[PDB]
């Protein structure tokens, strides 16, 4: 019976993060997952913008990127369907034609400004060839505090897992979960609700059963790491892949099968304290992203968290094409964007109707 006085915070059971932003994080996460609403992901890097602009022949300039974001952000009415916007670093500091910064414009319209804070994918080195880690934890706290100061209240960080030969290395499962869990707690320290995005990628010839197994294994380790690093569950969101066949598999799945595989997987791993899941659209078409989300919101399986969207291409592809990079296409681009936002709003509610969609 040799005893010693220690700090509670030195004991394993007392590892939970203490952040003065806890109540605000919880309130933001609730606003982000309001019924009928989801996130617009507008956080494409300048490299992604080249790809987005390739079809319409728009040169990749800072000004053109601003106009592409403005097509969507200066569109009246999207706050009916969109609870938050993930901005790219460059856009956070750009100005709308109203005179305000994009974060200020968002806040005036009751939409939560967020920021993509990761610094991109790099070779994992460990594990198997083609696996990738995500950079950006150095100087993270300073960056996150600066974003909070200009009005951001949530952030996003993407890690990816590449299925090859039906599996992924344990090295990538452990290391990317550890990265995401460290990102999440640093974000909460600085007042940003972290969107934790562990994307099992659609690329490859795997079937939906393989996607299910790998997703469940990857996400369970993300959850384990989040407990170990002491995340405030109530102030955190997950942005996972849906569980679908790989893009080169030649296997198809119905919306109901996708919903069943996805929700059963989440239900096996994801604490109900986490307020919401904002699915990424990845390789899905515009319409499939709406149909699949709608089917999840009609699933009879346990789904205590809100199931909604955080869509990039699935909100913007038609809109960019109709815009064409020209001021004369602004009207048509806005109509296309607003249509998609409405469809995804309905899908969150489980009330989307494919027949109404495929109209235009």
């Amino acid at each position: 019976s040799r005893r010693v006085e220690v700090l509670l915070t030195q004991l394993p059971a007392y590892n939970r993060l203490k952040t003065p932003y806890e109540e605000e994080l919880i309130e933001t996460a609730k606003k982000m997952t309001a019924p009928g609403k989801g996130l617009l992901a507008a956080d494409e890097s300048t490299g992604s913008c080249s790809k987005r602009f390739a079809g319409i022949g728009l040169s990749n300039t800072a000004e053109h990127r601003r106009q592409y974001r403005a097509l969507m952000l200066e569109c009246a009415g999207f706050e009916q369907y969109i609870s938050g916007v993930i901005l790219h670093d460059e856009t956070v500091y750009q100005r709308a034609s109203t005179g305000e910064t994009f974060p200020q414009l968002l806040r005036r319209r009751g939409v939560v400004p967020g920021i993509k804070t990761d610094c991109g994918l790099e070779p994992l080195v460990e594990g198997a060839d083609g696996e990738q880690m995500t950079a950006g934890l150095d100087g993270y706290v300073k960056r996150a505090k600066k974003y909070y100061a200009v009005g951001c209240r949530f952030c996003k960080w993407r890690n990816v897992y590449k299925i090859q030969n039906g599996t992924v290395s344990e090295a990538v499962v452990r290391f990317n979960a550890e990265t995401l869990a460290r990102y999440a707690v640093l974000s909460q320290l600085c007042g940003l609700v972290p969107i934790v995005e562990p994307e099992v990628m659609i690329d490859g010839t795997h079937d939906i059963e393989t996607c299910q197994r790998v997703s469940q294994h990857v996400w369970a380790e993300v959850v384990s790491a989040l407990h170990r690093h002491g995340v405030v569950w109530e102030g955190c969101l997950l942005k996972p892949n849906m569980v679908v066949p790989g893009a080169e598999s030649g296997q198809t799945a119905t919306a109901e099968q996708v919903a069943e595989y996805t929700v059963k997987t989440l239900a096996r791993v994801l604490p109900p304290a986490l307020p919401g899941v904002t699915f990424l659209s990845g390789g899905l078409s515009e319409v499939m992203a709406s149909e699949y989300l709608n089917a999840m919101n009609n699933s009879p399986l346990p789904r205590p968290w809100k199931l909604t969207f955080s869509y990039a291409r699935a909100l913007q592809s038609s809109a960019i094409k109709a815009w064409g990079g020209k001021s004369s296409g602004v009207a048509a681009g806005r109509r296309a964007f607003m249509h998609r936002a409405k469809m995804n709003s309905l899908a969150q509610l489980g009330r989307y109707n494919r027949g109404d969609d495929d109209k235009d």
Partner: nanobody
Amino acid sequence: VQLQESGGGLVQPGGSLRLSCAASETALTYYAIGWFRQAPGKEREGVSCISAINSGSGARTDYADSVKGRFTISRDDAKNTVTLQMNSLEPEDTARYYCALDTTDRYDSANGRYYCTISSDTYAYWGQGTQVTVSS
């Protein structure tokens, strides 16, 4: 998606009509809303517009010079309607009248307020319109 205009009709010079613009799924509260009219053989022209509501000071409105003092636009965000009260109608008010949403976020941050324009360029979701005929 289209707004639905109603309230049109046939009246004599000096009479009134009240046009109503209803949306069934869109929350009108988020938009500036405009009334336009198109007389036979002529181009569509803006008649009146109303901005999103400014807290404390209320929505801002504008009117074509030809209708100032005779028409009043107003909005009811709870009923999701916009109204155009048209008094002292004249034969030259005869036209099909349409309402539309401005798809532009019309906020002026230098002056801290929402505004609206009678220009039709950024308007969309035109309904089938409502016929207004003024004659003896």
